[PDB]
Amino acid sequence: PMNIINTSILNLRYESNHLIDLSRYASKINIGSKVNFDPIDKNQIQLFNLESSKIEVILKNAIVYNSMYENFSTSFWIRIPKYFNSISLNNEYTIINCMENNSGWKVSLNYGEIIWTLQDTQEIKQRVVFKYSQMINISDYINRWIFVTITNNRLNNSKIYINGRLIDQKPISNLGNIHASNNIMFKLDGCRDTHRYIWIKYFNLFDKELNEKEIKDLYDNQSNSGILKDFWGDYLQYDKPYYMLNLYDPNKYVDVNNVGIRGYMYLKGPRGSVMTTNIYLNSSLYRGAKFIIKKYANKDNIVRNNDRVYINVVVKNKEYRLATNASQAGVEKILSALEIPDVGNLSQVVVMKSKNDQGITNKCKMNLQDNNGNDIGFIGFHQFNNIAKLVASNWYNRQIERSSRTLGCSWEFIPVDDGWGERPL
Amino acid sequence: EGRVERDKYANFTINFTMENQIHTGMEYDNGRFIGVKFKSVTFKDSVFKSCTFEDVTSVNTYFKNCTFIDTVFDNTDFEPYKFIDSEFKNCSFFHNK
Numbered sequence: 001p002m003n004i005i006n007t008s009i010l011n012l013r014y015e016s017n018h019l020i021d022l023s024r025y026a027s028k029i030n031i032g033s034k035v036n037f038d039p040i041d042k043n044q045i046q047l048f049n050l051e052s053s054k055i056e057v058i059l060k061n062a063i064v065y066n067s068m069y070e071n072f073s074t075s076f077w078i079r080i081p082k083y084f085n086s087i088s089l090n091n092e093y094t095i096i097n098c099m100e101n102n103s104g105w106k107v108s109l110n111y112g113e114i115i116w117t118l119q120d121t122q123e124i125k126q127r128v129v130f131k132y133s134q135m136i137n138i139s140d141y142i143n144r145w146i147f148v149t150i151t152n153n154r155l156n157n158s159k160i161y162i163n164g165r166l167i168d169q170k171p172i173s174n175l176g177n178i179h180a181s182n183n184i185m186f187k188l189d190g191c192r193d194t195h196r197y198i199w200i201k202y203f204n205l206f207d208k209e210l211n212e213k214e215i216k217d218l219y220d221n222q223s224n225s226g227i228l229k230d231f232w233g234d235y236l237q238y239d240k241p242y243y244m245l246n247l248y249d250p251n252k253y254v255d256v257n258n259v260g261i262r263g264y265m266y267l268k269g270p271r272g273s274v275m276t277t278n279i280y281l282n283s284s285l286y287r288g289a290k291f292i293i294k295k296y297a298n299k300d301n302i303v304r305n306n307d308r309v310y311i312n313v314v315v316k317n318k319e320y321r322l323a324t325n326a327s328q329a330g331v332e333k334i335l336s337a338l339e340i341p342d343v344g345n346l347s348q349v350v351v352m353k354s355k356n357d358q359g360i361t362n363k364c365k366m367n368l369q370d371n372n373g374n375d376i377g378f379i380g381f382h383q384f385n386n387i388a389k390l391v392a393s394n395w396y397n398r399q400i401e402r403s404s405r406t407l408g409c410s411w412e413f414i415p416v417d418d419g420w421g422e423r424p425l
Numbered sequence: 426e427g428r429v430e431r432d433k434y435a436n437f438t439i440n441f442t443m444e445n446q447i448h449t450g451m452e453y454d455n456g457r458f459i460g461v462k463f464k465s466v467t468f469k470d471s472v473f474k475s476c477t478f479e480d481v482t483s484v485n486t487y488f489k490n491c492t493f494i495d496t497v498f499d500n501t502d503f504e505p506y507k508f509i510d511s512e513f514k515n516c517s518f519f520h521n522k
């Protein structure tokens with residue numbers, strides 16, 4: 001881990017079967033009985049709208065905040081399910097609480113909002129707010145892992161950063177002595193939506209205002225760039241059905257015209273919409289054939305950069321194999337969905353790769369290979385008589401990455417998730 | 426039609442013209458309206474749960490004070506004016522370009 005973490009005043013991590021503070025100060029952590037840890041990555045913590053769903057960090061007296069001038073920052077990742085219920089409009093709820101006797105700091109949420117609040121011993125408070133809309137085709141934020149960083153310079157400003165970019169700031173120099181709490185309560189507090197929850201990961205507390213570079217480094221390090229991710233930002237996994245999104249035209253979905261070597265897959269649109277009256281209106285995500293990633297070439301279930309895999313394709317609740325005949329005329333090799341026992345010597349091995357971008361590693365590429373391991377090419381699409389058929393093409397492999405030409409071969413994998421609330425088809 | 430309770434129909438398929446009818450206060454669970462032509466049909470104070478409307482056309486057809494839950498509208502002609510004071514919860518709308 002990098003130096004800023006090593007010197008953090010709090011470093012909350014799951015290790016050797018316990019949630020502990022790895023900071024020099026080794027603060028005590030109390031865990032309530034209804035806190036859920038993700039079995040695949042136990043640093044991912046789920047808190048429900050229940051009294052016993054809580055984590056309490058009892059801080060060492062030394063690092064308890066009680067100052068007029070000491071700068072400090074916090075960072076963490078959060079994944080917030082879509083808001084569904086109108087009771088959630090105008091209902092601000094605390095999630096991370098270091099307030100005592102009406103002074104200190106807190107992280108709270110509201111409909112389409114992440115809120116940072118400071119309050120001094122004179123009852124003077126200041127709020128800094130990140131806003132995201134639920135009326136949007138495809139959101140970067142709704143139900144997707146977000147990296148939050150909040151910094152406080154006592155002489156001037158408090159800043160909120162989202163995924164490493166500055167989003168809001170407000171002057172705080174009118175605030176006097178801030179006397180924060182002896183402990184930090186991670187818990188849903190004041191939430192009127194019975195079914196609300198959050199996921200959180202990698203909470204840290206720093207005793208300085210973090211600068212832009214430190215924030216960028218923190219974002220990149222904690223992104224886990226060796227491991228591929230799904231659309232939501234979770235680890236990409238084997239044996240899990242994913243709807244597909246192509247980054248060149250996110251308004252299409254994958255369809256199969258017929259199964260077998262004479263058939264083809266293609267991109268078909270528009271995606272259409274999913275909505276709740278006055279609450280959200282988004283592009284529908286649960287459309288078209290699903291891909292299942294299959295092990296070929298680690299005992300765990302996580303898909304890593306450069307893993308060689310097979311891809312099954314689910315058409316009317318049956319599994320087929322993604323494949324092509326590389327002997328077909330032309331650079332663009334049209335893909336088919338084959339009966340699995342029928343695949344024979346067809347080209348089907350896929351090298352999973354991430355697009356080398358900033359942030360979470362969830363823009364994925366799939367390099368098709370023949371049975372001798374020779375590249376046939378990244379999977380994208382090509383127009384044949386106005387039909388956008390899926391293809392493997394080595395033309396893609398010849399392009400500069402970050403050139404717009406590679407959008408055609410960039411995908412996201414979307415599994416059915418509790419925080420999305422669309423009917424799967 | 427699949428009448429199952431006092432207030433509901435369930436697990437039915439309609440694929441024929443529906444004409445000159447008013448339906449009030451009913452719930453419809455897992456109803457499939459497939460290739461239906463609605464003509465002067467009003468649904469009023471009704472609930473549609475996990476229904477599918479697919480390849481439907483409609484003339485002088487209204488849903489008044491209806492709630493739609495987990496319902497799919499796939500290639501319908503259901504513009505906003507088909508609905509009066511109606512509510513949608515987790516509903517999907519698909520249409521060919």
Ligand SMILES: *[C@@H]1O[C@H](CO[C@@H]2O[C@@H](C)[C@@H](O)[C@@H](O)[C@@H]2O)[C@@H](O[C@@H]2O[C@H](CO)[C@@H](O[C@@H]3O[C@H](CO)[C@@H](O)[C@H](O)[C@@H]3O)[C@H](O)[C@H]2NC(C)=O)[C@H](O)[C@H]1NC(C)=O
Nearest residue numbers: 081084195196197417418419420421422423494495514515
């Ligand atoms: C709109 O959709 C949301 C989200 O629900 C998810 O998507 C739906 C379309 C369905 O496919 C669901 O299966 C899927 O979870 C609905 O909110 C959710 O309601 C369900 C109850 O139907 C809640 O389930 C509860 O789960 C808790 C544990 O967390 C159990 O203790 C309960 O016994 C119960 O099973 C679920 O928590 C809730 N999710 C959220 C984020 O609120 C919503 O009901 C739906 N709207 C309407 C009007 O139907």
Ligand SMILES: *[C@@H]1O[C@H](CO)[C@@H](O)[C@H](O)[C@H]1NC(C)=O
Nearest residue numbers: 450469470471489490491510
């Ligand atoms: C709609 O129906 C509900 C009950 O189903 C009723 O309470 C309400 O008054 C109705 N609204 C109108 C405008 O008729």
